[model samples]
Target chain A: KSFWGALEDPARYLVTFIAFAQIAAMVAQYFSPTVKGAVILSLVWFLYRWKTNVITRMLSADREKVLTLDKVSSVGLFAIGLMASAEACGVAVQSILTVGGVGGVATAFAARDILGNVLSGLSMQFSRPFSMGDTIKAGSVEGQVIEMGLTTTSLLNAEKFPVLVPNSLFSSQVIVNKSRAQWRAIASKIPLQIDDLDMIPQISNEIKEMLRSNTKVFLGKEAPHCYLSRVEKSFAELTIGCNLIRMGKEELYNTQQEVLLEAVKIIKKHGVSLGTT
Target chain B: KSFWGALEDPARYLVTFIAFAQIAAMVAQYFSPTVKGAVILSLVWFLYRWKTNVITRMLSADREKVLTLDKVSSVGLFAIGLMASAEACGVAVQSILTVGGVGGVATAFAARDILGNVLSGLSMQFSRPFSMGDTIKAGSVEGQVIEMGLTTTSLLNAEKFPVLVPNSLFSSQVIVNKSRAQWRAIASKIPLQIDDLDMIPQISNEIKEMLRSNTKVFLGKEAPHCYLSRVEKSFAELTIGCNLIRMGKEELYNTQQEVLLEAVKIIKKHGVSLGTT
Candidate 1:
C-alpha cells in the first residue's frame, strides 16, 4: 500500500484476493468441481498480476522505486508459497508429493535457461564481482552499468542500446574495469622526427616544467614525468603518465588539455617537425 | 588432487578440482555410511582449497579475502545435509529441510548488503554516472574509485585509506561523481577593467575553437561548447565546457594546460589584468 496505488498494492489486494480464493477453494471442494475451477481461475489471475506489474516494479533499476516495491513482493512471495502448500495439501497429499517430484524435475529441465540466469544472478550477489554502475566489460558486453538484477546486468551503451548480459558469463571470462581506483594514462605518441631528438631534451624539460605548474597535469598527485622512451615505426613516442592529484573529471580533462597544448606551442614556435626518416 | 597441489598448472588444477569434486560427491554417496564421512571430508577439502585460491586470485581485494575465507566454514553445511540423508530417511529429510531454511535465512541477511552493493556497482557502470578513477566526494568521504565490485566498490582517498561502499549507495544516495562523463571547461575569474562585456563573446569563441581542435579531448559523441556562465564578485566567469574529443585521461590534462597558457598569453598581450571590483 505504501508503494503502489490502491488497486495495485500487491500486498494488500493480492493477499486479500488469494485468501478469499483459497477459502472458496476449500468450500468448493465439498460442493461441485466447477466451483473449484472458478477458484483456480482466480488464483491464476493473482499470479499474472503479481508477475507482470508488481515484479517489474520491484526489480527496477531505480533504487527508490525498488526500495518501495521489494517489501510488498517479499510478502507476496511468502503468501503465494503458503497458498500453494495449502492447495497441494487439500488434494491427495501422497499423490501430490509424487507428482511434485516428477513435476519439479521436468520443470527444472525445461526452464534450464531461466534457472541458469537466476542462479547466475544469485551467485553474482553471493560472490559480488561487479555492481550496478561500475564500468565493467563482462559477459562479452562493454558499457556503463545500469542495473544488476536476478538474470543479467543491464548496460546503457555509448550508442544508447540497453544490453543485457547474463551474470553467468563472469564465471568464465575476465572483466575489464576501466574506472576501478586508478585513473589510467594512455600516452599520446607525439611522433617527432629523429632530427628533433636534440630538441627532445629541451622539449622534455619545458614540458615537464609546464606540466608541474599546471593543476590538470598535477591531478591531486604528482604529475608523472614525460619520458621519450622509444623510437617507433613512424615517430618517437613521448609518454606522459600521471595519477590524478585532486582534480575532478572535468579538471583532469582540462589539465591534460593545458599540458599538451603548451608542449605543442613550444614545438610550434621553435618550428620543429618530425625528421623524415 | 590437481588443484590442491601448489605446483600444478593453474588452469589444469582448476579443471581437475571442479571435475573431481562432483565425481567424489556423487560416487561417495553410494558407499557405506561409515566411509561417507571421509569421502565428504576429502571432497570438501579439495573443493575448499580450489575455490578459496580461485576466489582470492579473482578478487584481488583485501576485504573480499576475508569474506571468501569465511565461506570455507560452510563445508560442514553440505556435509551435515548429506549425513542426515544417509542416517535416517525421516530425520534426514527434516535435516535437509532445516538446512535449506537455515541456509536461506543466513544468506538472506548477507544478501541484503551484497545485493545493494552489486546493484550499485551495475548502476555506476551503465549510467557512466561516474568513472572508476574519478575522485569524488560521496557524502563526506572524498576518495578515488579503486574497484567497482559486485557488492562493494572501493575508493582510495587522499589519506591513503581505501573506502568500500556497498553498490547500493550509488542507487540510493546523491553521490557527487566529480568526473561523471564529459569534461567541463573550468574557467577562473580573471578581473579585467572593461566597461562592456564585448570581450566575453570573443573569449568564448576562441576557447571553444581551441577545445574543438585539441586532439586531447575525448569527444567521442558529445560536442564542446562555452558560455559566459556567471559574473563573479570581481570578474566575468567564462565557462568552457566540452564533451571530450578523442583524448584519453592523460591527454586531456595536457590539452587544458595549453589552453590556459594561451589564454594567459592573450590576456597579457591585450593588457587584461586584475581590476578593482
Candidate 2:
C-alpha cells in the first residue's frame, strides 16, 4: 500500500521508473519473442495508466509535496517478501546469508553515514520530535520537512535546497525544534548607531508596549526583553527580543519578519537617530 | 587530544576538587567527631577552592549560562571513574554491573530520546554533512550552529530560538547544503492578475539578467529560469527563479528577499499589479 501510495505521485513515480525498466528487461530474456513483445506492450499500457493516476493525485493534493512513512515501511516489507519468496524457490539461504552478510557489512561500512541517517530516522519515529510537515532546525538549516526516512529526513529549506539531514545525526543532536515548543521567541537585530545605546532602555520599553498591543504576539508566558548586546566599531546592536508564545509557532520565520518590520516602523516613526557618524 | 585539550579549560580544577570531596565524604563515614571536624573543614576549603575556579571560568566565559559537553561529560565520567576506583579499592563489580545494567536499561528507556539523539550525533560527526559551525537544514530550522553534541546539535536560528536538533537525522537525507554548494538557485512565486500573464516571459528573462549581473551569487551549474507555474483563481502564479553561482550559496535568503522585491519592481515597471490587495 505504501509503495502503491508513493507511486500515486508522478514526481515520485518518475524516480521509480528505472526499477520498472529493469523488470521489463529481465522478462524480455525469458519469454518467447512474440509473447514477450505483447507482454511488454501490456505492461507499458498499465504503467502509463498508473502514471496518470499518480499525476492526477499530485495535482489535486492540498500540498505540492507529499510525505508518507507508510510507503517507506512498505518498501521494506516488499523487499523482505521478495527475499523470502526467492528463498522458497530453492535459492540457497546459507550461501545467500553468507554473501549477503559480507556484502551488507561492506555496504554498511561504505554507507555508514547513510546507515546513521537511517537509524536516526528510526530514532525520530520513536522519539517523535516533529512530524511530517513540521518546521525543524537540525542544526543551522531551516526548512519545511517533506519526508523522514530510516536514514534521512528530507526538507525543503527556506532557500528551498531540498535539504537532507542524516537520520542518525538528527536523532543525536538537540533539534531546535520550533514545532515541539508551545511558543518560540523571534528576535531580530539591526544595527543602531552607538549613540543610540543610551536610548536602549527607552526603546526596549516602547517595543515591549508595541508587542503587547499586537494581539498577533505572545505576552503572558514569556515577557519581552531588550538589551544592548554589543557596540561594534560602526554600530550598537539593540535587540528587542520577544518570546512569541502560542500564536506564532509554525510560521516562525514569517512572524519574526512581521514583528521586526512592525518594530522598525515604530522606531523609525518615533525614535530619532543620534549618531556622530 | 580532544579530551586532553578540553581539560586545558580552567573548569577541570572543579573536577579535582569534586574528587577530593568524594574522599572527604568517605572519610566522614569512618571518622569519630574530632576526625570528622577536621575532614569536614578540609572538605569546605576544597569546595571553596573549587567554587572560586567555577566562578572565575563562568565570569571569563562572559555567558551567564554556560554549559559545555566537557562539563557534562567530565562530571559523568568522574562519577564512573569514582565507581571504577571504588571497585579497585574493594567494591564488588558484580553488583555494580547488575545495578548499572538495570539502571542503564531504565536510563535508556527514560532517555530513549537522548540515546537516539546521541546516536544521530555520532552519525553527524562521522558523515560530516554539516559540521559544528556550518549552516545546515533539517526540518525548518536555520542558523549558524553554536555546538554539536552526542544527543543534540545547537543552532541559533534566525529568530534566535537557540535551536537543538538531534544529530541522528543528519547523515541520510539528500541535504541541500548552502555552504558547500557552488551556487544556489533561488526560486520564488509571485502571484499576479492573468492580465499580467504576458509578463511571464519578460519577467523570466529580466530576472535571469538581474541574477547574472548580481555577480555576488553562486548559482551552481544551472542558470536561472522563470515560467508561469499555474493559473490561480484570481491571479496567475509565475515562478521567477534565478541562480547565483558562487556567493549566492550563503546569501540564499537575502537573495530571495531582494529578488522578490526586484520582481515586484520589474512587474510594476511593466505596469502589472502584483496582487497587492
Candidate 3:
C-alpha cells in the first residue's frame, strides 16, 4: 500500500485522458472505425504501463528483452491502429507503398540517419556491457551515465555538468568503465644502490614474502609482484606492483603504507641504503 | 587502362546482368511491369558501385555519411522494385497494409533485433571514436579492431585471435583505446632510511631539478614530479613520475637510462645512500 501510493501513477493520468470505449455504440455511427482504433490504442497503452511495473520486479527475467519485445508490439499495434484511423478518415494506406517508387526516394534519404540510432539503442539491450549509473570514459567525455535514450544518452560529467552524447558515438570508441574493478591497484617503485646487486636478491625475496603475508594484498595468480626490474646508472630499482582488496577508501591507502614500510625495513636490515636518481 | 584493370568493376557485372530495356520490352510485352522494375533496380545498383569508388577518394568529405545515404536509397529502391514485381506477378501489395493488422505483428517481432544492429552500425559512423587497426579494450576483450561490419565488428586479440562483437554491444560499453596517447608514461619509486628525513629535502630538490634539466623528460604543466611521498618506521620513499616524448621505442629506452643514471649519481654525491624495507 505504501509503494502503491509512493508516486503519481501515470496510468491513472492516462485513463483520465481517454473516454472509455463502452459508450461506443451510442457515438455517431459514422465514427465506428475511429472508435475501434481508439479502443485498441488505449488497451496497448494500459498493458504497457502494467508490464513496465511487473517487468521491473522481474529483475533478471531479462528486463531489456521484455521491454524490447513489448516496444515492438506497441509500434506494430500503433501502426495498424493509425492505418485504420487513416482509412476511416478518407486516407489510403495500401496505395502508399505502391507509389513509394517516386515519393519514398526522398523520404528514405531524409530518414537515413535516424534508423542508425534506433538500432544502436537496441544493441545495448542484448550486448549490455554497461548499465545506467556506470562511470565510463568514451571520446572526450568521462562521466556517470544518467540515462540512455534512443538517439542520445545523458551523462553527468561532474557535479551538475550535463553531457548528452549521441548513442552512435559509443559504437566505435573504446570506453573504459571504472565501475567493475574488484580491487584497487597499488604501485610504487623502490630503488637501491647499483653496487648492491649482490644483496638485491636477498632484499627482494624478503619484501616479496612480506607482501604475500600482508592481509591487504589481494593475492592470486597475478599476485603482488616485487622484483629488481631495472638497474639505472643512478640507482638499481625494485618495481613493486600489486592490487589491494576492494575495501574502505582510506583503508586501501592504509594498505600501501604497511607494505612499503616492511619493504624498507627489510632493505635497511641488509644495510643497503636507498638511492635516489 | 592498366590502373583501372587493377580490380574488376562491379558496375560492369551489374550491366551485364540486366538486359537492355529495348530487349526487355521486346520480350515483356505482357511483362511490362517486371521489365520496368528490373531496369530501375539495375541502374540503382550500378550507380551505387560507381559512387563507392569516388566516395573513397572524397575521404574527409565524410565517407560514412555518403555510404549511409546510398544504403538507404538502395533499400528503399529494392522495396519499391519488389512491389512492382509483385504487382506484375498478380500479387496485391496495396491490400497488404490494410491487413497488416494480423500478419505484421509477427513480422515486427522477428525483425526487431536486426533493426537494433542496423542503427548501432550507423551510430559508429557519426561517433567514429576508434578506427580500424586501433587497439582498444572493452569489457573482457582487448584487441585491434580488424574490420567493422553492420551487425558485428571484427578484432584480433593476438596472432590470429579473432573477436567479433555485435555493433549493439558497443552501444553501452566503455572502450579504452591506446591509439591516441602522445606520451609514454614512466614511473619508479625510491626508498630512504626513515632516520634520513633530514636529508630528504636536499635529495628531493636535486632529483626534481635533474628531472627538469633532463632532455628525455617531457615537460609541461604537470612536468616530472619528484618528492618524498611517504615514511615509515623502516624507511622513507620518493615517488617519481613523468612521461617520455613520442619517439623511437629504443630511443625512449635510451632516454630513461640517461635520466636514472644521473639520479643515482646526484644522490650519491649528497651522501644519501639508497634504503630498502
Candidate 4:
C-alpha cells in the first residue's frame, strides 16, 4: 500500500526516486567522486524545483507570501541539499562552508549601513511617530510626509519640493508631528527700543485688536497673548503668540511678517523709537 | 612521532582533536541525536572563534577592517553552525530554513529605503560628485559638505546649521558642487522702469566704480559686469554680476545689498525715476 501511494503521487514518488538515485550515486562515488557529486547535486536541484513548484501553487492566492516562501525555501533547501549531496559523494563539506564564510564577509561589509536603516525603518514602523500624509518636522527638514518607503521617508515642503529623509534619522532626531495637533501657533518676534518698556501693555492691546479684527487669522477663542520674551541692554524683544486659521508653513511665515510689519508701523506712529543697528 | 608533532603544534593538535570529536559525535548520534547536534554545534563555534581570532590579529593594524571581520565571521559561523548542527541532530533542515525565509522577508520590508540610500551613497562615492569640505547646492539645500557617511551626507549651511541629507536625494536632485570651480559669482537682480533702459551702460559703469572704490567688495581683477537679463511689460530686469572679496554667504549678501542700495541712491540723485510696485 505504501509503495502504491508513493507511485500514485509525484510528491511521494519523486522524493522516493531521488532517495534511490542518491544511494546509487553514493555507490558510484567509488569510481568517480566528482561525477557522483555532480549527479547527486543535479538530482537534488530537480527535486527542489519540483517541490517548490507544488508549494508555490498551493500558496498562489497569497502572492507576496508565496514569493517570500519561494525565496526562503530555495535558499534553505540549496544549502542543505548541497551539503548532504556533497557528503554522500565523498566531497569535503568544510571547504564549501569556508567559501560560504568568505561570501558572508563580503555581504556584511557591503550591507552594514543598509542593515542599519532596515532595522531603524522597522522600529519606526512599529513606533509610529508619524504616518503617511502627516506633517512632520525632523531636524531641519519640515514638510508633509508624502511616502514612507522601506529605508526613507519622502516629504513635500511648502514649495511642493520632495525631501527624502532616512528612517534612521527619525530614531535619533526629534520628530514633531504637526498634523496631529488641531490648533497651531504663529509666533513672531518684534524688537523695540529699551525706552519703549512702558508701552508694552498698550502695544499688546493694539496688536490683539488688529488680529481679532482680521477674520483670516487668530480663530482661537483664547484671548490674544503677547509677552516680553527677552530684555537686552539696548532692545526689548516682544514676542507675539497667536493661533492660525489652519494653514501651512508658507502662510504662517507670510502672516507673521505681515503682523510684524503692521506692529512696527503702529509703534513708529505712537512716537516710540524703533530699534536700529 | 606524529602524535608528538601534533602535540607540539596547537593548530595541528587542535584540528586533530576536533576531527576525532566529530567522528565520536557522529557515532554517538545513534543514541541521542540532539546531544550529538549540540556537541557538534559547540565545537564548530569554538573552532570558528579560534580562526576568527587569528584573522582578526593579522588585520589588527587596520582597526576598522578588524571590527568588520569579527562581525562578519561571527554571523557567518553562527548561520552555518546552526544548519550543520540541525542536520547532525536528525532534525529537518526545512524548519530552520523557513525561519531564515521569514527573517529575510522582514529584513527586505524594513530595508527598502535604507538600501536605496546605501546604494545612492555607494554611487555618490564612486561618482565623486562632491568630497568633504566642498561647497555644494543640492536642490533648495545649499551648504558645505562637512562629512559623508554610508547612508547620509552632512552639510554646514550658510547659517552654520548642520543639514543631514540622505544620499538617495543626491541622485534624484540637482547637485551643484561650487567648490569644483576656482571662483564663485554673486548675482543680484535689480528692477527698473523701461525708460531707464537707456542708462544700463552708464549705471553699470557707475556701479563698477562704486564697487571698486569700496575696500569691502569686488576684489576680482575683472571689471564688474551688468546686463539686462529680461524685460517685463512694466519693468526692465538688470542683472549685476560681481566677484566676492573672499567671503561667505552672509558677507556676500550684505555686500550685494550695500551695492544695490548705493545704485538706488545714485539713480535718485540723478533724478531718474525709481520704479516702485
* Candidate 3 lDDT, A199-228, residue by residue in tens: 665676677778778787677424566665
lDDT score at residue A158, model 2, on the 0-100 scale: 81
Put down candidate 2 lDDT per residue, A1-277, tens digits, no spaces.
2335433554444435545666677763532333323333333334445544564556555442332533543453343333333333335645654544454345445655544554445445544667788877665677888987766778989887898776655644456555655556666676654322345556656777887776556765446655544333234445566766566535767777778887777566645443332
lDDT of 1 by residue, A120-230 (tens): 565565566556687666535778888878777788876879988875455434455545544434244465554324455577667667666655333555455665544
Which candidate wins on lDDT? Answer: 4
- lDDT of all predictions, in order shown? 0.54, 0.55, 0.62, 0.63
Estimated TM-score for each candidate:
0.35, 0.33, 0.38, 0.43
What lDDT tens digits, residue by residue, belong to model 4 across residues A5-91?
A: 323454454456557666777663443444345444554656565766667567744677777877877886776576555455545
Candidate 4: CAPRI quality band: incorrect
> Arrange candidates by DockQ, highest first: which order?
2, 4, 3, 1
For model 4, the stretches where C-alpha displacement exceeds 4 angstroms are A1-263, A266-277, B1-43, B49-75, B78-140, B144-151, B156-162, B166-184, B194-204, B228-235, B248-250
Better of 2 and 3 by DockQ: 2
Report how large a share of the reference interface contacts model 3 reproduces: 0.01
User: Which sequence of candidate numbers ranks them by lDDT, best first?
Assistant: 4, 3, 2, 1
Give DockQ: model 1: 0.02
What is the Cα-based lDDT of residue A35 in candidate 3? Answer: 46
> Model 2, which residues run further than 4 Å from truth?
A1-277, B1-125, B139-142, B161-177, B194-207, B217-220, B232-234, B248-254
* Residue pair clashes in candidate 4: A150-B113, A151-B113, A151-B114
